Amino acid sequence: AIKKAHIEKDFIAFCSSTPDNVSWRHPTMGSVFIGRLIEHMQEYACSCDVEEIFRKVRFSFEQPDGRAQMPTTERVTLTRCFYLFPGH
Amino acid sequence: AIKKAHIEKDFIAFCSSTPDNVSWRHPTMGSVFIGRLIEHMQEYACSCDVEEIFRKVRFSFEQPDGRAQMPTTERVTLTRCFYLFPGH
Amino acid sequence: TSSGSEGNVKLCSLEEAQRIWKQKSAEIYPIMDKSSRTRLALIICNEEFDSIPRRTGAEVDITGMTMLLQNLGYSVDVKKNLTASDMTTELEAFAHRPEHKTSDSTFLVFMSHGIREGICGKKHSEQVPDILQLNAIFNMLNTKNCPSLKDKPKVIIIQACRGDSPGVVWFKD
Amino acid sequence: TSSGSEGNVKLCSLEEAQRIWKQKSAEIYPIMDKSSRTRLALIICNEEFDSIPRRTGAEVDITGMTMLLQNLGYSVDVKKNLTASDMTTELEAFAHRPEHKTSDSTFLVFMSHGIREGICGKKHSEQVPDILQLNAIFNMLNTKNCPSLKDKPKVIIIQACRGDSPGVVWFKD
Numbered sequence: 313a314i315k316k317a318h319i320e321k322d323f324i325a326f327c328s329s330t331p332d333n334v335s336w337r338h339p340t341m342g343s344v345f346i347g348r349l350i351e352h353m354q355e356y357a358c359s360c361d362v363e364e365i366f367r368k369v370r371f372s373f374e375q376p377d378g379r380a381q382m383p384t385t386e387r388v389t390l391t392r393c394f395y396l397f398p399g400h
Numbered sequence: 401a402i403k404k405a406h407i408e409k410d411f412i413a414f415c416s417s418t419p420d421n422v423s424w425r426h427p428t429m430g431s432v433f434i435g436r437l438i439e440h441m442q443e444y445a446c447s448c449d450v451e452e453i454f455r456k457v458r459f460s461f462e463q464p465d466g467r468a469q470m471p472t473t474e475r476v477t478l479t480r481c482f483y484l485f486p487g488h
Numbered sequence: 489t490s491s492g493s494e495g496n497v498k499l500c501s502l503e504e505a506q507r508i509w510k511q512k513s514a515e516i517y518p519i520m521d522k523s524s525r526t527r528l529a530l531i532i533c534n535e536e537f538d539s540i541p542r543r544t545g546a547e548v549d550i551t552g553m554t555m556l557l558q559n560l561g562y563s564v565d566v567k568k569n570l571t572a573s574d575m576t577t578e579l580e581a582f583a584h585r586p587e588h589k590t591s592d593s594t595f596l597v598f599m600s601h602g603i604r605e606g607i608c609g610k611k612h613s614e615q616v617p618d619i620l621q622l623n624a625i626f627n628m629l630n631t632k633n634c635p636s637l638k639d640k641p642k643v644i645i646i647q648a649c650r651g652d653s654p655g656v657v658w659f660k661d
Numbered sequence: 662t663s664s665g666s667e668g669n670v671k672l673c674s675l676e677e678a679q680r681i682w683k684q685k686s687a688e689i690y691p692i693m694d695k696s697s698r699t700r701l702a703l704i705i706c707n708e709e710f711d712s713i714p715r716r717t718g719a720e721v722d723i724t725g726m727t728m729l730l731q732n733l734g735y736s737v738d739v740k741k742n743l744t745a746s747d748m749t750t751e752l753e754a755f756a757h758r759p760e761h762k763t764s765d766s767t768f769l770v771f772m773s774h775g776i777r778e779g780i781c782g783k784k785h786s787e788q789v790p791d792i793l794q795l796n797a798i799f800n801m802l803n804t805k806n807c808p809s810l811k812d813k814p815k816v817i818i819i820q821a822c823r824g825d826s827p828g829v830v831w832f833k834d
């Protein structure tokens with residue numbers, strides 16, 4: 313037998329800035345959003361679901377300097393918490 | 401003195417379905433997304449932040465029937481957890 | 489009891505509030521004093537349209553949402569049957585409300601017919617589109633156009649179709 | 662130690678995993694057996710462009726992301742300097758990978774120049790736009806076009822500008 317499934321579900325997108333706005337990159341240090349994401353993933357993958365981690369990344373950008381940007385979570389259809397369970 | 405602030409921050413949007421897709425409404429019972437949101441807010445505002453609540457609303461739609469839809473969280477720039485603290 | 493201001497919304501006890509303030513550090517939005525804060529919410533609901541079918545049952549949604557937002561401590565403005573231009577005017581007026589200065593958050597609720605591009609105004613038809621884009625709502629409520637809500641959570645709720653598709657695919661078990 | 666497969670990623674202990682499985686009920690995505698699962702990730706990074714400036718430092722991002730996704734247990738495909746058409750072809754090929762059937766999740770990473778409409782391909786210019794829309798990425802990875810990833814978390818990461826604006830406004834303290 314056939315069964316219905318949602319066409320779009322279990323997605324999460326994480327963008328480097330808000331719509332209309334620039335995202336920064338350093339010639340030797342790389343892109344700050346990327347570097348910030350790795351650091352937070354390394355630290356928090358063990359204890360936080362990815363949505364929580366993405367919020368924490370956002371929080372780290374809260375205080376604006378000369379190179380300001382605000383990463384944005386987009387089009388979320390995660391119905392459950394996505395824990396990476398690193399080591400397992 | 402003047403200080404810089406992010407132009408877009410602390411937003412969360414919650415839509416009744418995914419892009420391209422319909423959302424349902426009953427002539428006497430109202431819109432299921434709205435009714436589901438109220439029920440979950442009533443139950444979980446005391447214990448969960450709004451993002452968590454929205455995920456729970458999504459979860460309630462997980463099993464698709466004849467009137468299937470998947471509420472979607474959009475363009476999130478919440479840097480902190482938004483707890484309603486009902487009663488306070 | 490449901491006889492209080494919070495109605496059917498389950499209350500957060502003082503022990504519960506301290507547990508949340510312990511499980512999470514300074515990663516929670518600050519809440520203003522209940523005695524002095526002036527929380528505002530706006531519901532825009534389109535029920536009667538020029539060309540598209542009547543949104544029968546919208547009254548249930550208006551009632552439910554209005555009461556809920558009041559239960560949560562928000563003063564609720566309800567606006568009905570507006571064009572996209574009217575919605576923009578109302579949103580601009582909402583952004584200008586002085587109460588936001590002494591508020592810690594806001595809720596915006598939109599209920600109407602919708603297409604992929606956005607939310608339908610009362611005058612909408614295929615020939616002459618009457619659409620409010622979600623992008624416009626954000627723009628009108630951001631730090632530039634609504635400085636009073638800087639650093640404060642702005643929750644936008646939209647009940648509307650986003651296209652014609654049923655949103656489903658088949659699979660075999 | 663960072664000498665293991667997980668490198669610099671802090672490990673989740675068995676007691677930690679049970680605490681998470683207790684604080685949340687059946688509201689967690691199921692994880693497949695480590696011995697048998699075939700997790701896949703895709704990084705598309707555009708560094709060298711026909712018209713727009715060279716994305717110097719992209720190598721640091723490629724290295725960092727590749728190693729991280731491997732640390733998390735994903736086999737990482739890295740594709741570089743693609744047009745929007747090439748990106749679409751690669752995404753379609755990724756959606757067709759049989760390993761997704763025996764996987765519990767996926768990560769997609771896009772790194773390029775970007776405009777409001779989307780992500781720039783290597784051939785992009787104002788005269789002849791070469792753009793991949795975020796909408797297209799979702800469509801290609803959804804249940805219709807990627808049934809193998811049904812019910813499985815699909816994480817999309819995009820490093821790119823979304824316009825020309827600095828993203829800031831002034832306020833006085």
Ligand SMILES: *CC(=O)[C@H](CC(=O)O)NC(=O)[C@@H](CCCCNS(=O)(=O)c1ccc(O)c(C(=O)O)c1)c1ccccc1
Nearest residue numbers: 422423424425426427431466543600601602603647648649
């Ligand atoms: C598309 C849109 O913007 C609005 C959103 C809104 O009004 O909140 N959605 C709808 O108009 C959808 C609901 C139509 C009302 C039908 N409800 S019913 O229970 O009375 C009914 C009547 C006849 C039927 O055959 C059914 C059925 O079970 O199929 C139900 C909407 C949903 C899908 C397509 C078009 C409109």
Ligand SMILES: *CC(=O)[C@H](CC(=O)O)NC(=O)[C@@H](CCCCNS(=O)(=O)c1ccc(O)c(C(=O)O)c1)c1ccccc1
Nearest residue numbers: 334335336337338339343378716773774775776820821822
């Ligand atoms: C817009 C876009 O798509 C890309 C995204 C990406 O490549 O990841 N963003 C940029 O190209 C932005 C970074 C430009 C590189 C400048 N870095 S720098 O440290 O070398 C530098 C050089 C000169 C300067 O004056 C500065 C400075 O501090 O202002 C920095 C980008 C960001 C803003 C506008 C345009 C491009």
